[PDB]
Amino acid sequence: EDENLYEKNPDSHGYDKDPAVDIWNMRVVFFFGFSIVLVLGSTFVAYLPDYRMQEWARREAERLVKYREAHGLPIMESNCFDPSKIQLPED
Amino acid sequence: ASHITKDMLPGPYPKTPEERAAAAKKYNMRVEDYEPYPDDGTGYGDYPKLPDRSQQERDPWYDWDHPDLRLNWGEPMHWDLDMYIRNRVDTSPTPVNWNLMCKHLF
Amino acid sequence: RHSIFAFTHVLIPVWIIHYYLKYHVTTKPYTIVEKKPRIFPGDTILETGEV
Amino acid sequence: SGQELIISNWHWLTIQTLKLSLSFKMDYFSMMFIPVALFVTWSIMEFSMWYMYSDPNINKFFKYLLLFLITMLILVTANNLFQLFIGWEGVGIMSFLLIGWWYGRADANTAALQAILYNRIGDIGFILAMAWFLTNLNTWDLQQIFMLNPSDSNMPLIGLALAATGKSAQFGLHPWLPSAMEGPTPVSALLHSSTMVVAGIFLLIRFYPLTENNKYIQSITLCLGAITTLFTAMCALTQNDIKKIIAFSTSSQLGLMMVTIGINQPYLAFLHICTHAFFKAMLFMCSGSIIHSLNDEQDIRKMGGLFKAMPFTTTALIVGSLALTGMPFLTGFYSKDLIIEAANTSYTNAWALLMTLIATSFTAIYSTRIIFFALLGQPRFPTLVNINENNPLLINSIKRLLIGSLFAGYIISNNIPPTTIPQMTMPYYLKTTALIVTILGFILALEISNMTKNLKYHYPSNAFKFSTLLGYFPTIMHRLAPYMNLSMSQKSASS
Amino acid sequence: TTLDPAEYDISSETRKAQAERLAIRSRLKREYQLQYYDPSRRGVIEDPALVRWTYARSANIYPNFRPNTKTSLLGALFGIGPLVFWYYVFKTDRDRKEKLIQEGKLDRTFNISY
Amino acid sequence: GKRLFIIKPSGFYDKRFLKLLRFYILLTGIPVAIGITLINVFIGEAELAEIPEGYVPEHWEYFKHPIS
Amino acid sequence: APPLTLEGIKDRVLYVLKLYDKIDPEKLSVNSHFMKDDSLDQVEIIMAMEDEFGFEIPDIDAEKLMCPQEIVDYIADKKDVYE
Amino acid sequence: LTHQQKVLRLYKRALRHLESWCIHRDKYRYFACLLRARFDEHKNEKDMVKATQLLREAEEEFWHGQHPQPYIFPESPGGTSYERYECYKVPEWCLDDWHPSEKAMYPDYFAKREQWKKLRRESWEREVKQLQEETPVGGPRTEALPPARKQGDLPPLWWHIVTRPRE
Amino acid sequence: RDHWVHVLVPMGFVFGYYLDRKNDEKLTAFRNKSLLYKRELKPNEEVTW
Amino acid sequence: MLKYIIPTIMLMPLTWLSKNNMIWVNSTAHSLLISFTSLLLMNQFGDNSLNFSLLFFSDSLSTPLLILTMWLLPLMLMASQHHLSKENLTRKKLFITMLISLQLFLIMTFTAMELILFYILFEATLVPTLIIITRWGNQTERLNAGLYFLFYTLAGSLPLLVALIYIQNTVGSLNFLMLQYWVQPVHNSWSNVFMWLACMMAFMVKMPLYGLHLWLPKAHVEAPIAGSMVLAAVLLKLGGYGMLRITLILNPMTDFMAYPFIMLSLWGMIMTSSICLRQTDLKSLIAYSSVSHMALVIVAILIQTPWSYMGATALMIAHGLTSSMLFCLANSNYERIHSRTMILARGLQTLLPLMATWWLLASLTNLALPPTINLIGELFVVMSTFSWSNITIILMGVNMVITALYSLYMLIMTQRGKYTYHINNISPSFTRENALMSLHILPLLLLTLNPKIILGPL
Amino acid sequence: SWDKDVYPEPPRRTPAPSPQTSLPNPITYLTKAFDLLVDRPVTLVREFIERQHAKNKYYYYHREFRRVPDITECQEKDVLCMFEAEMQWRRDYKVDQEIVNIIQERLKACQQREGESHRQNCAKELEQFTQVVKAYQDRYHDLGAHYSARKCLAKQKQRMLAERKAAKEAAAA
Numbered sequence A: 001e002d003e004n005l006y007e008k009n010p011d012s013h014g015y016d017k018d019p020a021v022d023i024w025n026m027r028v029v030f031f032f033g034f035s036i037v038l039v040l041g042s043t044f045v046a047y048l049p050d051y052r053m054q055e056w057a058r059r060e061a062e063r064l065v066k067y068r069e070a071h072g073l074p075i076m077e078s079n080c081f082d083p084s085k086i087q088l089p090e091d
Numbered sequence B: 001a002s003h004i005t006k007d008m009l010p011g012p013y014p015k016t017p018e019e020r021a022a023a024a025k026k027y028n029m030r031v032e033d034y035e036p037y038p039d040d041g042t043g044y045g046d047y048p049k050l051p052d053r054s055q056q057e058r059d060p061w062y063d064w065d066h067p068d069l070r071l072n073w074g075e076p077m078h079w080d081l082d083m084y085i086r087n088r089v090d091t092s093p094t095p096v097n098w099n100l101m102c103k104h105l106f
Numbered sequence C: 001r002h003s004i005f006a007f008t009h010v011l012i013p014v015w016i017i018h019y020y021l022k023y024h025v026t027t028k029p030y031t032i033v034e035k036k037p038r039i040f041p042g043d044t045i046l047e048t049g050e051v
Numbered sequence D: 001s002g003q004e005l006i007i008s009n010w011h012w013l014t015i016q017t018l019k020l021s022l023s024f025k026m027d028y029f030s031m032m033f034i035p036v037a038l039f040v041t042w043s044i045m046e047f048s049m050w051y052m053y054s055d056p057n058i059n060k061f062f063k064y065l066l067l068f069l070i071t072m073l074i075l076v077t078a079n080n081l082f083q084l085f086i087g088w089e090g091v092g093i094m095s096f097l098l099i100g101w102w103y104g105r106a107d108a109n110t111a112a113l114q115a116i117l118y119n120r121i122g123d124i125g126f127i128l129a130m131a132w133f134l135t136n137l138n139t140w141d142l143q144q145i146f147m148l149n150p151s152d153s154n155m156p157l158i159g160l161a162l163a164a165t166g167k168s169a170q171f172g173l174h175p176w177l178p179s180a181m182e183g184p185t186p187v188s189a190l191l192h193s194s195t196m197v198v199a200g201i202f203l204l205i206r207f208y209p210l211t212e213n214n215k216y217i218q219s220i221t222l223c224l225g226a227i228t229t230l231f232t233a234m235c236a237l238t239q240n241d242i243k244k245i246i247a248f249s250t251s252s253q254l255g256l257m258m259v260t261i262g263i264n265q266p267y268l269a270f271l272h273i274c275t276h277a278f279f280k281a282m283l284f285m286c287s288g289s290i291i292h293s294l295n296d297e298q299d300i301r302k303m304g305g306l307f308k309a310m311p312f313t314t315t316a317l318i319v320g321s322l323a324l325t326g327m328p329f330l331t332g333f334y335s336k337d338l339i340i341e342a343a344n345t346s347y348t349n350a351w352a353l354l355m356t357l358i359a360t361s362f363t364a365i366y367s368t369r370i371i372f373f374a375l376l377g378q379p380r381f382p383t384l385v386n387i388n389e390n391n392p393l394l395i396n397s398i399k400r401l402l403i404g405s406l407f408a409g410y411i412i413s414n415n416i417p418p419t420t421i422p423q424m425t426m427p428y429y430l431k432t433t434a435l436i437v438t439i440l441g442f443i444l445a446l447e448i449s450n451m452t453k454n455l456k457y458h459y460p461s462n463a464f465k466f467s468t469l470l471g472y473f474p475t476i477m478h479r480l481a482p483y484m485n486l487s488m489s490q491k492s493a494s495s
Numbered sequence E: 001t002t003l004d005p006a007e008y009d010i011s012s013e014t015r016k017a018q019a020e021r022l023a024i025r026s027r028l029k030r031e032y033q034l035q036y037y038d039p040s041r042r043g044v045i046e047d048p049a050l051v052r053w054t055y056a057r058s059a060n061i062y063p064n065f066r067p068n069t070k071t072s073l074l075g076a077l078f079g080i081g082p083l084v085f086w087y088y089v090f091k092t093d094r095d096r097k098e099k100l101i102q103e104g105k106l107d108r109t110f111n112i113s114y
Numbered sequence F: 001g002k003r004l005f006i007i008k009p010s011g012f013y014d015k016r017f018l019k020l021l022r023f024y025i026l027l028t029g030i031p032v033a034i035g036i037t038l039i040n041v042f043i044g045e046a047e048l049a050e051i052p053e054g055y056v057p058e059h060w061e062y063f064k065h066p067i068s
Numbered sequence G: 001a002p003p004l005t006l007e008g009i010k011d012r013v014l015y016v017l018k019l020y021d022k023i024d025p026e027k028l029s030v031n032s033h034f035m036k037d038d039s040l041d042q043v044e045i046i047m048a049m050e051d052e053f054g055f056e057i058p059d060i061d062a063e064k065l066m067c068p069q070e071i072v073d074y075i076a077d078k079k080d081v082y083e
Numbered sequence H: 001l002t003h004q005q006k007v008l009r010l011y012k013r014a015l016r017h018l019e020s021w022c023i024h025r026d027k028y029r030y031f032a033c034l035l036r037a038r039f040d041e042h043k044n045e046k047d048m049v050k051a052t053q054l055l056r057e058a059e060e061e062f063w064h065g066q067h068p069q070p071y072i073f074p075e076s077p078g079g080t081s082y083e084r085y086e087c088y089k090v091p092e093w094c095l096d097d098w099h100p101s102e103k104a105m106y107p108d109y110f111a112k113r114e115q116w117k118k119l120r121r122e123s124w125e126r127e128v129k130q131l132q133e134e135t136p137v138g139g140p141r142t143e144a145l146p147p148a149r150k151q152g153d154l155p156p157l158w159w160h161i162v163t164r165p166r167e
Numbered sequence I: 001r002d003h004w005v006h007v008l009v010p011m012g013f014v015f016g017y018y019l020d021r022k023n024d025e026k027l028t029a030f031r032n033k034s035l036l037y038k039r040e041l042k043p044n045e046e047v048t049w
Numbered sequence J: 001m002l003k004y005i006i007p008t009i010m011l012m013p014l015t016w017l018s019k020n021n022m023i024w025v026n027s028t029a030h031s032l033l034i035s036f037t038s039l040l041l042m043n044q045f046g047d048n049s050l051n052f053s054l055l056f057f058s059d060s061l062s063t064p065l066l067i068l069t070m071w072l073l074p075l076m077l078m079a080s081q082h083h084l085s086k087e088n089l090t091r092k093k094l095f096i097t098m099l100i101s102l103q104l105f106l107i108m109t110f111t112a113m114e115l116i117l118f119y120i121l122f123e124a125t126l127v128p129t130l131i132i133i134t135r136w137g138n139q140t141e142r143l144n145a146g147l148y149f150l151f152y153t154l155a156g157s158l159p160l161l162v163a164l165i166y167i168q169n170t171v172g173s174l175n176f177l178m179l180q181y182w183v184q185p186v187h188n189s190w191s192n193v194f195m196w197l198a199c200m201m202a203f204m205v206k207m208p209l210y211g212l213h214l215w216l217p218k219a220h221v222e223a224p225i226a227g228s229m230v231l232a233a234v235l236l237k238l239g240g241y242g243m244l245r246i247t248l249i250l251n252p253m254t255d256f257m258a259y260p261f262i263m264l265s266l267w268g269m270i271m272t273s274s275i276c277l278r279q280t281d282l283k284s285l286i287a288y289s290s291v292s293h294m295a296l297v298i299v300a301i302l303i304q305t306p307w308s309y310m311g312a313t314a315l316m317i318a319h320g321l322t323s324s325m326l327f328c329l330a331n332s333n334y335e336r337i338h339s340r341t342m343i344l345a346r347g348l349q350t351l352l353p354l355m356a357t358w359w360l361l362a363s364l365t366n367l368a369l370p371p372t373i374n375l376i377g378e379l380f381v382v383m384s385t386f387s388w389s390n391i392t393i394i395l396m397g398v399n400m401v402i403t404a405l406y407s408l409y410m411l412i413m414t415q416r417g418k419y420t421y422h423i424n425n426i427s428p429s430f431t432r433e434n435a436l437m438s439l440h441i442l443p444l445l446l447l448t449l450n451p452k453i454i455l456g457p458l
Numbered sequence K: 001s002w003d004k005d006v007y008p009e010p011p012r013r014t015p016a017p018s019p020q021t022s023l024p025n026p027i028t029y030l031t032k033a034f035d036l037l038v039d040r041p042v043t044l045v046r047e048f049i050e051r052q053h054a055k056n057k058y059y060y061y062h063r064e065f066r067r068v069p070d071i072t073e074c075q076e077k078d079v080l081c082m083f084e085a086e087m088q089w090r091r092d093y094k095v096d097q098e099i100v101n102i103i104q105e106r107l108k109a110c111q112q113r114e115g116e117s118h119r120q121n122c123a124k125e126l127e128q129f130t131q132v133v134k135a136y137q138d139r140y141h142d143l144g145a146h147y148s149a150r151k152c153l154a155k156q157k158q159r160m161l162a163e164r165k166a167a168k169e170a171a172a173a
Helices: A037-044 A051-068 B100-104 C005-011 C014-026 D031-043 D045-051 D057-078 D081-101 D108-135 D140-147 D154-166 D174-178 D184-191 D198-208 D216-233 D242-262 D266-276 D279-294 D312-325 D335-342 D361-374 D390-404 D433-449 D472-489 E022-036 E046-056 E072-076 E082-091 E095-101 F012-016 F020-042 G006-020 G047-052 G068-079 H006-016 H026-039 H047-054 H107-121 H128-134 I011-019 J005-011 J024-029 J033-041 J073-079 J089-108 J116-122 J128-134 J144-148 J151-167 J193-202 J232-240 J259-273 J280-293 J311-329 J356-362 J377-388 J392-412 J430-436 J439-446 K037-055 K081-111 K155-161
Strands: none
Touching: A037 F020, A037 J033, A037 J439, A051 K081, C005 C014, C014 J024, C014 J089, C014 K037, D031 D057, D031 D266, D031 E046, D045 D057, D045 D184, D045 D279, D057 D081, D057 D198, D057 D433, D081 D108, D081 D154, D081 D184, D081 D198, D108 D154, D108 D174, D108 J377, D140 K081, D154 D198, D154 D216, D174 D242, D184 D279, D198 D242, D198 D266, D216 D242, D216 D361, D242 D266, D242 D279, D242 D335, D242 D361, D279 D312, D279 D390, D279 G068, D312 D361, D312 D390, D335 D390, D335 I011, D361 D433, E072 E082, E082 J259, F020 K037, G006 G068, G047 H006, H006 H026, H006 H047, J005 J033, J005 J089, J024 J073, J024 J089, J033 J116, J073 J089, J073 J232, J089 J116, J089 J128, J089 J232, J116 J151, J128 J144, J151 J193, J232 J280, J232 J311, J259 J280, J259 J392, J280 J311, J280 J392, J311 J356, J311 J377, J311 J439, J377 J392
16 A cells, blocks of 8 residues: 655665665765865866956057057047048948 | 645535545644635636645744644644745744834935 | 974964065066065265255 | 055956055054954953863854954055945954854844844945946945035935945844843954944944035934944843943933034044954853853843952942943043034034933943842852953953053043044033033942842732833844735735 | 733623633643643654644645635736836936947046956 | 753764765776876976977877866 | 762751741751741741742642741752752 | 632742841741631632632732832843843754854764654654544543553653753 | 777867868868958968968 | 766666665666766867767756756665655666656756757656656645646646747747847737747746646645655746746747736745745745746746846745755655644754754755855845835835745744653754755755856857 | 066065064975975976976977958958958957956055055056057947947947047037
């Protein structure tokens, strides 16, 4: 009529299912879950190379600004993308 | 698997004396001031026979209450009236309604 | 002793974090941003004086 | 020679125009409050070694309390407004682990529920002032805010003022401290004296180069702190717990410091914080040995006289209680006196000076109330008198404080670079009469305490108006706002 | 306010046979403790007062329901009511701001962020 | 004297927990830490501007880092 | 920190027999049954322990307190007395 | 509750509410016999409304002006630190699962632990033998015979006979 | 036997990775671009196609 | 994905091919090896864009989003073994294969390169999830909830084929999102309104609204064995990201009718939070929380103009780890008490002190402790809609205040006394109960160290 | 390191302490002891790496791009020429972000230097920074076309409004 399983504790430890080779289910999830993914994969993106070409544009911004500050070149131009190349239809 | 009077039904006048207590003993013999007449006003989606509301209320307040545990902590058997508003609420103190705080803020 | 119970506690992390600042000013263009002199006379650090 | 510093250690994430990395601030509050804040915590854990002496859960407490210093110390060292928001919430989440220290106890866990409720109203005001700096000021580092002062600071700074009301116990949020006392005693000695209530007004103190103009601010500020004084004065009357009597008394200290902002006095205001932190962490701990001596009443009922083989802790109280009368020359004399006599030149409501100075008496009558009821009369309390005052762990704590306590306002203010101009004119009939206001509080409490003790037997009449010893605010709002919203406005628009 | 709560009334001798309403519950209490005390239970009590509570609250309210009254159609004054009102606020918003943004200027010139 | 016996639920499984948590995280985390120290000392990057790299530019490994 | 045993209450219940001046110190020590010595002789006889012990004295404590050692019996159950 | 013992429920709290307001001990003690003379108005009489009108006017001036924040005797239904000892909270029978080298300590305690269980393991040949007999049909409060007519073990064995001690 | 249920199945990754270059080696449309990425004269834009 | 679907389809002829009870330890062992291959070839740079190989992959360039898709299959097998082991072995292995098959369509999805392959993959789900609700679920009223799990998503998604093929025959071809350079504008008409309507309304079926969301507390209430596919149903709800793909272009300028989607998702936001403080179910308790701050992201998208795409990138994964972790708390404390009703759980915190830390930090991610991945994005939703108007902070801020109560409303329910009952519920939190309870915050605060990868284009 | 013209500041100008009193001061006891307990564990190990780090050198090279088209090429429905122009325009925008960050901390160089005056001096950073960010949101910030990134199809057409409606419809400029 009613058959069911209860608290698996026959005074043993128990990890997932039972004693032996299912005992290895611990160190297949402790050692593969973390300690390789949470270590090497955590290390992998730590020193990962330049995201969205940023680290070039860091020092590239350091170079070109003082060249505008060198001779006469204004800064934050918004200069119509090399004008007199558009017919500019009036109406 | 409890099917016999598993919940309330479309009451409250389907021989309301045979409601309490053939099952759901909110009243002893349909005269206990807790017979399932108190379907507030029905028509709405309120409680039907509903071993539920307007029974004596406004606090389970964790009293002295020694004849069982019976106040709020320790499971009396079947006395459910209303819940989920009372684990943090209480009864009447010595003063009364007088809104003197608005005069105090005046 | 009071020989290594405090020496492991305080005396070891002194050299590590000072190395993290000496190797920091030469790299970052904004190091310590210490303020002005707040000097009422004129003194020997300059050449002029003030009354 | 100054040499104030900022640093540039390590980047956080960067966005389009602004980049915040991290930085620090070493101006007038880091070189002042941090040796003060650590000295108190250095002297407070020996009592918890004696107070929590029978608990096998002792190791969680010293672990949890140290991280609570981290969220209290990273706030004052910050100079990015993102970093201020980190410490603004980090201080409250530790509190739920401190009021909720003792499990069960169907009011104290509700008191942990009452604690975080009023904290969130102070949270929503600070973020409103945040986003207005994003829309205009292009960043929220504290430098570029004070680089150019905007025109309309009226809209952001009300949210700064509303953020102050969340944790500095202003009017409307006043049951937060008398409900937070339900935990252990040096927990509440830390929660209420030098932490969790100085940071509620500390953020306003940093914002001094802007708070001069925009005159809607200053009238609201000083009038608000005046309300906080006397409602704590009237509800403290006929109160039957030692910890609750000291609970109101730090709130009328807050009524001073709220008014000190509207008058353009930044550093004299902060110097009152410099003195006040010494006081009640001593006093709750000094009164904590009394309660542990009896081990269960914690009432002002059934106490006795001072001298029931109790020499030292009675000497420790009268150092504190006379300072609490209003500082004739005691610990906080160089801060309390230089403010109420700085109320001479002002532009107030003039109801404010008719409200702040009256509470100076109401502060003084707090002192003798534990003298006249716990230290004066005949010995009466239940038997098996198991008193004990011999532990040098506690003796180390009390001796370390009172040496620093008496020399608090007299060494720090003795050597300070000046910032502003003093009053230097205090005329006839206008100069020191607030000290005389404190004197009559000894007289008035005498002919009530002795009259309730030795009289022509004024019989107990049941006719009195007792909406003063309660306040009538916890009577209805704790019965209405969790009733309307929680039940009727939900189950109508629920399922 | 909430409530008086009428903690005292009269007796002597109103409803002499009304007593032993505890006989309803003490029979259940005897049925409780006999179920509670046993050498091997290893499980919770069924407790049908909580069974009849949630299932007659979460479910069996829509079979109870009928729209035969307007106080059941009264939810129109709470659901869709303020939902028009926020848009009645917001439709007046964002266009008065836009006309001052289109015609004329009020912003600072260093509003890159945004 | 006043001496009794304290009632604890269990300490076995709970102190069995945090063991392999701590054990395996030091089984490979601590040994991989030396390579983060060895490549710091013996290996660097230098310097800037530009270099000319001949006519055809260098391959991948344009990074100013040991392992990047 | 100070413990307690059975001998402390055996002093106090016998002492308040002589403390109350209506009851002479010539009665029985632990079982006088109080009828040989309606209100104020079932409440006043324990109103003194309302002053000294005073753990609010619940409603069932009246009808048990006739036998004066049956007063003493349940306190060790409440106060958790030795062994 | 009955009419005669309704006087007793008020009489203890009539004086218990007064010591909240007093300042001395004798000041409260002088009003004990002083309030007794009001109680000595009707000494012994009938049980009718003459005894109820003494209580019908005890509605006023008892609830009217009642206990402005009184003494609470902190180990009580109310009062501060009433249920403070909850970090321990006596978890009786939390000690089933051990998986030993954690059951190494207290050897003689566990040897006695299984010993008491046979008193509970063998009681239903005696307790349930009278449980069907002592209850008439479905009637009142269901304690057994307090000696169980030979040996009362307990009747409430063992969760009440080994109930939680306080500390 | 030699456990084909085991690690032989992750050996299908390089079996997929060997097939993963067949799509790129027929996407040999453009060398002449102006993102440098120019394929000007070098044996560096030619390689790894 | 060059070879990502290729190794994981070979995992399928390994379940019934294997031995006896070895099938659990074998299936978890292979599964974590793919997780490095996911990390390796991805996360490249990066400047507009990485068109991956060909007509089947655009490499998920603007939003990575794909690492989270691959944690869960080596995360639920350790969870589903709580109450599954009562059946035949051939029937249990079928329950393993259908969950693995669920990942393979979703592996090709979220990248998808196109739109005509999108919709067939957008509808490639709902076949395995429905079977999980039918067989090996809980007690009755399953089958109507299975029908409510259909007949909404399928009801709204069918006009997408009415929409997309109407675009394919009109202007070019929707095979390439990157050949979408020429885009004609869309004016206000009485035909173009419906063109935007069918383009949007199907995406409101999955991430819910104050309307049409009654089905959502059915699958989470009546749910499989112990939160088994319920964790997958978290990604099923957040995986309606495709509005980011579509409405970024392809009638962007119709914002005149944006307002009833702004308003309905805003008063319904504050409402459905308070619609559960009187709920009596644990699995319904997290469900209505999962409506509210998932409805937060919708006004971050229809309102355009980044500083809104920044946080909305992170707010998808915000509860995506959190509500998955809360369901792991709710899948536990049910093998020991066989009813999910929360009120019966009085008297906790003393029998299980070890998991009591895990209750604290989990609910500390709803208050959310501003150096985390949760309040780093909600500040940018503040940073966007305050530039819209000054009123929007009010209703959105109270959402940060209601869930302050609504989270601690659960925590205090653990602390009670004497527990009245429970000769069962002995088990002091075995290894499977706490190792599976880990690996949620362990990457979450790890991502809070350098949260640079959790960022859109943007 | 860097270049000092990019990050200018006035010279340090640190005065003399001026003790003037024969009282014992503690500053002559602190700097005379603590300097050697830092220089020994730090500077020598910094020298020990300095010979060891010079064992081998490694090179990393600058990346300079190629920009043949600019704006108006090409015709409407094209793909090829309108892809390099996107690589033109978009990399011509991420440069323009961090140029502002240089000028932003240039303001921060003045403010934590004077402090006391801090407003009525430095003569440039309240002007020049507002001569950049003011000349920024016009025609280089696609307000509010920044969601679809406005790639060459709206960043030119704000500048169509900056030439058609602007400067000619002023009636008559």
